[PDB]
Paper text:
The S. marcescens Rap proteins represent founder members of a new bacterial protein family, members of which represent immunity proteins for T6-secreted toxins, as exemplified by Rap1a and Rap2a. We have determined the structures of two members of this family, Rap1b and Rap2b, revealing a new protein fold. The Rap subunit is constructed around a helical bundle of five helices (α2–α6). The Rap proteins display an extensive dimerization interface, consistent with the observation that each Rap protein exists as a stable dimer in solution.
Well-ordered crystals of Rap1b and Rap2b were obtained and the structures were elucidated at 1.9 Å and 2.0 Å resolution respectively. Rap2b has two dimers, formed by subunits A : B and C : D, in the asymmetric unit. The four subunits are similar, with the root-mean-square deviation (r.m.s.d.) between superimposed Cα atoms ranging from 0.5 Å (subunit B and D) to 0.7 Å (subunits A and C). An overlay of Rap1b and Rap2b subunits matches 71 Cα atoms with a r.m.s.d. of 1.4 Å. A disulphide linkage (Cys54–Cys120 in Rap1b, Cys41–Cys101 in Rap2b) tethers α2 and α5 together. The Rap1b dimer uses almost 24% of the accessible surface area of a subunit in formation of the dimer. In the case of Rap2b the value is 20%. Surprisingly for proteins with such low pI values, the striking surface feature conserved in Rap1b and Rap2b structures is a crescent-shaped basic patch on either side of the dimer. It is possible that such a basic crescent, if present on toxin-binding Rap proteins, may contribute to orientation of the partner during binding; conversely, it might contribute to the lack of Ssp binding by Rap1b and Rap2b. Additionally, Rap2b shares slightly higher sequence identity with Rap2a (23% identity for the mature proteins) than it does with Rap1b (20% identity).
Author numbering:
A (entry chain A): 20 to 119
B (entry chain D): 18 to 119
The structure:
Amino acid sequence: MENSLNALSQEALYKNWLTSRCIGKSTDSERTKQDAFRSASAYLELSKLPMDAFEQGEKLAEQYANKNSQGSVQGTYHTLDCLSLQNASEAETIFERYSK
Amino acid sequence: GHMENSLNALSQEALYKNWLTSRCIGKSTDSERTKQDAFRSASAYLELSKLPMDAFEQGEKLAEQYANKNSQGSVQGTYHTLDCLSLQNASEAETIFERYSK
């Protein structure tokens, strides 16, 4: 696990941290929330980014947790909102600001 | 409409990987609400995929096995969220994708 995590780029660790945080902040389930948050903590430990990437990323993760996208078909799409952080330009611009 | 407008610029591979992760989240969670959310999400990605259905029957297997991976972290508890996100960078996800695109 330590092995697979060490294979990830810094951009991937960050995106995974963002998605994980968003899942935890959106989910109804305390079980799932603490799974999501434990998972976010694992990515965070390996990041070489400074703390402000994560203070700014947390607000983005929360904004995506609350986006409440509606699709054709009634119901929540939080999983989709949270996964969109894998490829969202807002996530990439915070990452770019703090990585070089 | 706007959701698909928003997914239409995503690559076929990124659509497939998000479907995988979404299925994996749904299968691993013990909350029926999180499960239905994840499954509804998965279907949105499915809708824009041009892959044959064999890619999704093979991918479902992969997703359920990642949902049952049960990695242990340095803290006590499940890491299903991390196991499902690992499908975004898994060799297997990419090779299955390639096998059914061309």
